[PDB]
Paper text:
Bedaquiline, an antitubercular drug that targets ATP-synthase, is a key component of a new oral drug regimen that has revolutionized the treatment of multi drug resistant tuberculosis. Here, to understand how [name] effluxes bedaquiline, we determined the structure of the [name] complex using cryo-electron microscopy, revealing a novel trimeric architecture distinct from the canonical tripartite RND efflux pumps of Gram-negative bacteria. Structure prediction modelling in conjunction with functional genetic analysis indicates that it uses a periplasmic coiled-coil tube to transport molecules across the cell wall.
Structure-guided genetic approaches identify [name] mutations that alter bedaquiline transport; these mutations converge on a region in [name] located in the lower portion of the periplasmic cavity, proximal to the outer leaflet of the inner membrane, suggesting a route for bedaquiline entry into the pump. While currently known clinical resistance to bedaquiline is due to pump upregulation, our findings that several [name] variants increase bedaquiline efflux may presage the emergence of additional modes of clinical resistance.
Numbering used by the authors:
A (entry chain B): 1 to 31
B (entry chain D): 20 to 493, 688 to 952
C (entry chain E): 707 to 755
Write the structure that this text describes.
């Protein structure tokens, strides 16, 4: 819901950034 | 009232100081120093599964000449063409070298063979050479003592009159470069010591405060070094010389950063008019979380650096993180403790005069009132920095980055004096087929390969079974009876696998084999060698290419990919920490943009100064070290400044800017200049690569502190306004209070 | 006509295709020089002018 989503936007944003960074680093590493 | 942690730190000050001292003592007396423990367990710098390394191991395995890739050359020249006594002593020496099976694995006797002697002798018949395969890979100590042993065994016996013997190659080069760095250490340390003392007395205008800071820094450095050597001594974690050096540099930088942070905040608080106790409590409550966050961000980034594939960064991940954690722990426990003890006992930490805070408040006033034009000026300077970046070249030859008195350099000089190619850095090509090659048609194909290789733009010699002197430019015929001449059989073992399933040609470049062209040439060598067999029965065989240029091409590719991995990791972690600290999504983005822009401008200025003007090309390691240190220090300073700015927002956006400038700009500037000049004092070293790294970091921090951090980000903050703190809602000015 | 009277030189007379004074014609001469240099490489004429 709105409240439980906007009351914790920081941790979710960090999770998204870490996920993207991990995916990109994994893909680059295999080269 | 008073938080738990500072009260417990200060109440137990003396016992914790004693504990720190005794721990450092025990960790430094019972466990050797970092240089020794690092050298005993050094690791090879070439990746384990690179295309070149596998080729060298396989080539060694097939011909039964060891499993290593270290090699050296012996140069034999005289002022008169060599005679029979030359052969006599050459044979005696070669017997002696073959007697010592401990250190030399296998040998390549060309000059002793009449058929191939032409290919192992100068055009005027005045010089010769030999190849020795040595124990241990590159960079392991085994190679070092093996090359030293060969030097001793060759120099024990006196050469005949008229001739002189050298030792040459890459192994001797690395051994002597290690010795040269060790020699330069003393002078460089003396000069940097005097410069750092001068700078500290200049920043503080006192002798006692400088002495106390030196104490903080040395205790932190000794603790970090002892602890990391303790962990590495028991084979708990890996170590390497590059790791120890960068660890020392980072330890010094972080320790001085935090020491200046704490003492400056203390003195500022005292100047405001608070008593000793409240000054201590406010410095802790204003700097502790910043120090902790910066330390953990740097530790996390330097740990994430460990996923890299190139060992130069792989081995560098754990030890630096452990050292950084130790540094932050020491500077959070021991720091405030001794500050409290020193403040209480007598009268030592005492601010005198006030001339920097007022000046920096004035600079903040200028930034706030006219933020636009100052921004365009700063970005214009960054532009003049950036525009020289795209033209950037790099050189992998390490010969011409050292003084010319190293013995290997005289060996190289002799070789260049009597040879018109780069015959001291050859290569080897291999073809692995599935049938015996000791027959005529396969020889025609072999010669086809040799000729196809010879015709590449850059190659000068291609030494093969067909032509031992290395000029395959002729039509070929060898009747089958030639397999019975014993001399031909000896050459056959030298050049063909004993099973008959492999061939190898020795390829020597022209010019420097390690410049960019010498790196791009091996791909063409492989393509030509592949297309030469196309259509002949040998199709589908496996082609190996082992040599120095191959190794350096692999290293360059790994270098670019690892630089990008580390960049993404570091930048994303900076984003995370700024977001946690400020609770703003635009502020973190602005900081990320500014830091990357500063890296770019700094390196642009450095390349403008070092390659265009002084006419010396940068190394292939400067980028990595420079970016590591610059990113760490920038994270630290930006975190402090932004945290302070957030602290002073409540009374208006912009008077907060000028207050924050007065409070913290001076501290960050002092730390930046001290570290920058401590590094800049390295320009007088005779190991030019260290001069390059030191000067790059120095000029980079000068530009960062004096242009970017003091004029670009405060101006941006004052320009955007309340939109620097989105999504948080803030006000440009408080409610208008009455008179 | 071709060799030098003292016998220390030779000259070749080279004619282009199309328009010698367009961009390609200008670019061709470096290739000519490189080709000659690589042709003399390894032979007793190596390093000549």
């Amino acid at each position: 819901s709105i409240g439980t989503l906007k009351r914790a936007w920081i941790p979710l944003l960090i999770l998204v950034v870490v996920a993207i960074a991990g995916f990109t680093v994994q893909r680059i590493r295999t080269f | 009232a008073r938080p738990f942690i500072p009260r417990m730190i200060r109440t137990f000050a003396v016992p914790i100081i004693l504990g720190w001292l005794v721990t450092i003592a025990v960790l430094n007396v019972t466990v050797p120093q970092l240089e020794t423990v690092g050298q005993i367990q050094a690791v090879s710098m070439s990746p384990d599964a690179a295309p070149s390394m596998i080729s060298m191991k396989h080539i060694g395995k097939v011909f039964e000449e060891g499993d290593s890739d270290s090699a050296a050359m012996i140069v034999l020249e005289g002022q008169r063409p060599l005679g029979d006594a030359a052969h006599a002593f050459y044979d005696q020496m070669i017997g002696r070298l073959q007697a010592d099976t401990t250190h030399v694995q296998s040998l390549q006797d060309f000059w002793g063979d009449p058929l191939t002697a032409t290919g192992a002798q100068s055009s005027d018949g005045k010089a010769a050479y030999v190849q020795v395969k040595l124990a241990g890979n590159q960079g392991e100590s085994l190679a070092n003592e093996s090359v030293e042993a060969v030097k001793t065994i060759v120099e024990r016996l006196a050469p005949p009159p008229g001739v002189k013997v050298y030792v040459t190659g890459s192994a001797a080069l690395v051994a002597d470069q290690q010795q040269a760095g060790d020699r330069s250490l003393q002078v460089i340390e003396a000069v940097t010591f005097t410069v750092i003392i001068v700078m500290l007395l200049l920043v503080y205008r006192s002798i006692i405060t400088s002495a106390i800071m030196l104490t903080m820094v040395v205790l932190g450095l000794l603790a970090t070094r002892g602890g990391v050597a303790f962990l590495g001594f028991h084979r708990i974690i890996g170590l390497s010389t590059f790791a120890t050096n960068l660890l020392v540099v980072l330890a010094i930088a972080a320790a001085t950063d935090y020491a200046i942070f704490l003492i400056g905040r203390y003195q500022e608080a005292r100047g405001l008019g608070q008593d000793r106790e409240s000054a201590y409590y406010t410095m802790f409550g204003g700097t502790a979380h910043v120090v902790l966050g910066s330390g953990l961000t740097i530790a996390g980034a330097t740990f994430c650096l460990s996923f890299t594939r190139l060992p130069y960064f792989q081995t560098l991940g754990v030890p630096l993180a452990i050292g950084m954690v130790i540094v932050v722990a020491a500077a959070l426990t021991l720091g405030p403790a001794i500050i409290a003890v020193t403040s209480r006992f007598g009268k030592l930490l005492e601010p005198k005069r006030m001339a920097r805070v007022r000046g920096w408040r004035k600079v903040g006033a200028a930034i706030v009132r006219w933020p636009g034009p100052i921004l365009v000026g700063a970005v214009a300077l960054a532009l003049v920095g950036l525009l020289t970046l795209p033209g950037y070249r790099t050189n992998y030859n390490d010969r011409n980055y050292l003084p010319a008195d190293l013995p290997a350099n005289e060996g190289y000089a002799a070789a260049e004096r009597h040879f018109s190619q780069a015959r001291m850095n050859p290569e080897v090509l291999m073809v692995e087929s599935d049938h015996d090659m000791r027959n005529s048609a396969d020889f025609l194909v072999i010669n086809k390969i040799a000729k196809a290789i010879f015709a590449v733009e850059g190659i000068s010699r291609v030494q093969a079974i067909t032509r031992p002197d290395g000029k395959p430019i002729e039509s070929f015929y060898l009747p089958p009876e030639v397999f019975d001449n014993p001399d031909f059989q000896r050459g056959l073992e030298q050049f063909l696998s004993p099973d008959g399933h492999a061939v190898r040609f020795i390829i020597s470049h022209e010019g420097d084999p390690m410049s960019q062209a010498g790196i791009a040439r091996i791909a063409k060598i492989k393509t030509a060698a592949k297309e030469a067999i196309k259509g002949t029965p040998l199709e589908g065989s496996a082609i190996y290419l082992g040599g120095t240029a191959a190794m350096f091409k692999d290293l360059s590719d790994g270098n670019t990919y690892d630089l990008m991995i580390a960049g993404i990791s570091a930048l994303c972690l900076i984003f995370i920490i700024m977001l946690i600290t400020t609770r703003s999504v635009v502020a973190a983005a602005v900081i990320v943009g500014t830091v990357v822009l500063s890296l770019g401008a700094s390196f642009g200025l450095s390349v403008l100064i070092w390659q265009h003007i002084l006419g010396i090309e940068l190394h292939w390691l400067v980028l990595a070290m420079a970016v590591i240190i610059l990113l760490a220090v920038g994270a630290d300073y930006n975190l402090l400044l932004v945290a302070r700015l957030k602290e002073e927002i409540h009374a208006g956006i912009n008077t907060g800017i000028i207050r924050a400038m007065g409070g913290s700009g001076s501290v960050v500037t002092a730390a930046g200049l001290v570290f920058a000049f401590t590094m800049m004092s390295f320009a007088v070293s005779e190991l030019t690569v260290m001069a390059q790294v030191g000067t790059t970091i120095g000029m980079g921090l000068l530009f960062d502190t004096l242009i970017v951090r003091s004029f670009m980000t405060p101006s941006i903050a004052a320009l955007l306004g309340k939109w620097f703190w989105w999504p948080q809602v803030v006000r440009q000015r408080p409610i208008p209070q009455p008179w």
